[PDB]
Design an enzyme around this catalytic site. Structure first.
Site, short mmCIF file in Angstrom:
data_model
loop_
_atom_site.label_atom_id
_atom_site.label_comp_id
_atom_site.label_asym_id
_atom_site.label_seq_id
_atom_site.Cartn_x
_atom_site.Cartn_y
_atom_site.Cartn_z
CG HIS A 264 -22.43 38.01 31.19
ND1 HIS A 264 -23.57 38.47 30.55
CD2 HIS A 264 -21.42 38.22 30.32
CE1 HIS A 264 -23.25 38.91 29.35
NE2 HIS A 264 -21.95 38.77 29.19
CG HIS B 138 -29.66 37.12 27.66
ND1 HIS B 138 -29.69 37.95 26.57
CD2 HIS B 138 -29.83 37.90 28.75
CE1 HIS B 138 -29.87 39.20 26.99
NE2 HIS B 138 -29.97 39.19 28.31
CG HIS C 293 -30.58 38.97 33.36
ND1 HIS C 293 -29.30 39.45 33.37
CD2 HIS C 293 -31.08 39.24 32.14
CE1 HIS C 293 -29.04 40.04 32.21
NE2 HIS C 293 -30.11 39.92 31.44
CD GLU D 7 -30.78 42.37 34.21
OE1 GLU D 7 -30.98 42.57 32.99
OE2 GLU D 7 -29.67 42.49 34.74
CG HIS E 170 -33.47 40.50 28.94
ND1 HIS E 170 -32.40 40.98 29.67
CD2 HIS E 170 -34.60 40.89 29.57
CE1 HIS E 170 -32.88 41.63 30.72
NE2 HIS E 170 -34.20 41.60 30.68
CB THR F 242 -29.25 45.15 32.12
OG1 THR F 242 -29.06 43.80 31.68
CG2 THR F 242 -30.62 45.69 31.72
#
Ligand SMILES: CCc1cc2c(cc1OS(N)(=O)=O)CC[C@@H]1[C@@H]2CC[C@]2(C)[C@@H](O)CC[C@@H]12
Ligand SMILES: [Zn+2]
Length: 258
Positions: free
Chosen positions: A62, A92, A94, A104, A117, A196
């Site tokens: 992911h 990591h 997103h 996010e 993050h 999250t």
């Protein structure tokens, strides 16, 4: 049929396997900058990354995680809203399929192209797995990415992504300095929240920096070439791996700055 970010297994479905999805301190949230309150008494953040030891980069299906040796106090986050010492374990991102989405957290409903993050755990709990079971177990430093000039300190990450295209692939990734991913200012917003992604545990003190970093279109394009799938499975680009903003409920977002 495990969780992901698609039509049939994405954020609107997660509550079935993880009912805390509808809990009282879920993340991410919209940061309404006008309603956040300045909290003098908030201490300056202390980010001490001079001895950080990166080990490996992993595509976990992911996102991709850059992992660090967290068996000693080597890279720690302290101060701010935090009591005690939190040790860096991984970072990591997103990101989106388009530059207009991917973060996010949002700021006055604005979405950034991506969000970094930096994950830290409270050393009083001995290790990460025990920490995630605690309401004050983790501190995650969130940093927005906008598309503009390149971030030179990100390039080493971008260039190794070809080696971890698919789920489960990992590569050596030593001597990476996460200080090269930080903006000039450490002004921040903070609130109590959650992981999250599933299992959505409510164990995170979120610290979200006000100042985004700029990355180039070519840098974020390389994120979008990664795959959610494993090698030899049908290719699905790893894009839009973000959870939308969740209700604030009975929380106040505090600001470290006026
Ligand atoms: C904060 C970084 C973090 C850690 C974890 C996840 C997600 C992460 O993303 S985020 N965006 O920072 O919240 C989801 C998988 C989780 C994990 C924490 C450790 C576990 C809970 C394992 O014990 C079981 C499933 C794992
Ligand atoms: Zn994350």
């Amino acid at each position: 049929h495990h969780w992901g970010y698609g039509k049939h297994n994405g954020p609107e479905h997660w509550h079935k396997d993880f009912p805390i999805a509808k809990g009282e301190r879920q993340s991410p949230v919209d940061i309404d900058t006008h309603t956040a309150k300045y909290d003098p008494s908030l201490k300056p953040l202390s980010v001490s990354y001079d001895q950080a030891t990166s080990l490996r980069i992993l595509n976990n299906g992911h996102a991709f995680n850059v992992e660090f040796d967290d068996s000693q106090d080597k890279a720690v986050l302290k101060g701010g809203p935090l009591d005690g010492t939190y040790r860096l374990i991984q970072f990591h991102f997103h990101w989106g399929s388009l530059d207009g989405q991917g973060s996010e957290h949002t700021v006055d409903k604005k979405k950034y192209a991506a969000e970094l993050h930096l994950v830290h755990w409270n050393t009083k709990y001995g290790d990460f797995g025990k920490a995630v079971q605690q309401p004050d177990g983790l501190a995650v430093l969130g940093i927005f990415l906008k598309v503009g000039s390149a971030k030179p300190g990100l390039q080493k990450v971008v260039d190794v992504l070809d080696s971890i295209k698919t789920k489960g692939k990992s590569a050596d990734f030593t001597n990476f300095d996460p200080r090269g991913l930080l903006p000039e200012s450490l002004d921040y917003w903070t609130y109590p929240g959650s992981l999250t992604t599933p299992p959505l545990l409510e164990c995170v003190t979120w610290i979200v920096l006000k100042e985004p970093i700029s990355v180039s279109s070519e840098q974020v394009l390389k994120f979008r070439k990664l795959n959610f799938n494993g090698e030899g499975e049908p290719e699905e680009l790893m894009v839009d791996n973000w959870r939308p903003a969740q209700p604030l409920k009975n929380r106040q977002i505090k600001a470290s700055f006026k």
